[PDB]
């Protein structure tokens, strides 16, 4: 639309019994000419929680403003209630959306199980080489792979899959796949998986020689 | 009261879908219909509304060149048609008045195509591959499991599925759409 709705966290780390807070920044002040200041929230099929900061049948929400900096409390988080929270505007045509804060589940901090594959004969009979390496098991989410051929950073033709929280472990396992053909496969010898994480100061760094 | 739409629509680059939204349970002419998007981790966007009395439709402006709404108070139904459709239309798409559960749409030219899979061989931790595949979804059993959601590439999907054991092993991977099941043994 035109007013951007910035969120943060990205992902909030909450604890089935304690409190929990998260913001929503506006580009431009929601306080409008009649007074009122049109700010909701929704939980995501969709459903709105509150509307210019009043609940309206959920309950247990706050709730506060104002002007262009916006929060929202939950006095005591439960299992519900697990999942994104959107931030709303109507000053202000059109109506935007923030971002999203996703709920998980707090649990402690913990490195990923990183597995380098290279292409299997299989895929380089067919004239493709995929490089594959997984990241398993780690908290939070936030992680950062870089793939890196003969030394050198790759960033062209690398997707990236997370799952979601394990609901037994409360980690995240996620994919990094380097798509090259088979040509230029060949054409290099060492191709590099390096995992930055909050659990170290120092990358994760495995590799294999072709 | 309950806002109907299908679970997933698929269009090929260049050409038009038309999403539908039945309502029941009340009188379709006394809520507006609004449309969302929700690109996979972008935020929803409002595209517009439809007045379903009169027909009168208002559009946020970003949408308006590609979104022609409609009514028909005939059926209770409304209509969002999608033009010129692009790898960034790959979206799921809600009507609301309380909600429709969301239309799942993918663009792709891609006709159904079983999926490639590849081994990803070296507690020791296995994998495979599972490539260029169309449509989802696919099912990957093991013989600590990991299945890693697929991404759209090029009209095409690939996912991966790990495997953790403490040291035979095969991973078996099922494409109803084409009806193929192929199990792969690992070094």
């Known amino acids: 639309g035109d007013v951007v709705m910035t969120q943060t966290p990205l992902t909030l780390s909450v604890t089935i019994g304690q409190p929990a807070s998260m913001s929503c920044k506006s580009s431009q002040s929601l306080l409008d000419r009649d007074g009122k200041t049109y700010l909701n929230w929704f939980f995501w099929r969709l459903i709105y929680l509150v509307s210019k900061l009043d609940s309206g049948v959920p309950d247990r929400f706050t709730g506060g403003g104002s002007g262009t900096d916006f929060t929202l409390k939950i006095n005591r988080v439960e299992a519900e209630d697990l999942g994104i929270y959107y931030c709303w505007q109507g000053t202000h045509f059109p109506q935007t959306f923030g971002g999203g804060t996703k709920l998980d589940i707090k649990r402690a901090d913990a490195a990923p199980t990183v597995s380098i594959f290279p292409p299997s004969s299989e895929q380089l009979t067919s004239g493709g080489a995929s490089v594959v390496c997984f990241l398993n098991n780690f908290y939070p989410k936030d992680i950062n792979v870089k793939w890196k051929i003969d030394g050198s950073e790759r960033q062209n033709g690398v997707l990236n899959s997370w799952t979601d929280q394990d609901s037994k472990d409360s980690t995240y396992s996620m994919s990094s796949t380097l798509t090259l053909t088979k040509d230029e496969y060949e054409r290099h010898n060492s191709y590099t998986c390096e995992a930055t994480h909050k659990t170290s100061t120092s990358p994760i760094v495995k590799s294999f020689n072709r | 009261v309950q806002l109907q739409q299908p679970g997933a629509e698929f269009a090929m680059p260049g050409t038009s879908v038309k999403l539908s939204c039945k309502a029941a349970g009340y009188t379709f002419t006394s809520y507006w219909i609004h449309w969302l998007k929700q690109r996979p981790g972008q935020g929803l966007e409002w595209i517009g509304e439809?007045?379903?009395?009169?027909?009168?439709?208002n559009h946020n402006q970003k949408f308006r060149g590609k979104s022609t709404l409609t009514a028909d108070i005939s059926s209770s139904t409304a209509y969002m048609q999608l033009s010129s459709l692009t790898s960034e239309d790959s979206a799921v798409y809600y009507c609301?008045?309380?909600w429709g559960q969301g239309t799942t749409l993918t663009v792709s030219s891609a006709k159904t195509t079983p999926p490639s899979v590849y081994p990803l061989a070296p507690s020791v931790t296995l994998g495979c591959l599972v490539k260029g595949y169309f449509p989802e979804s696919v099912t990957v059993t093991w013989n600590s499991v990991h299945t890693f959601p697929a991404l759209l590439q090029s009209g095409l999907y690939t996912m991966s599925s790990s495997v953790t054991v403490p040291s035979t092993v095969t991973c078996s991977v099922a494409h109803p759409a084409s009806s193929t099941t192929v199990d792969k043994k690992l070094e």
């Open positions: 609301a008045a309380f």
């Open positions: 439809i007045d379903p009395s009169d027909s009168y439709t």
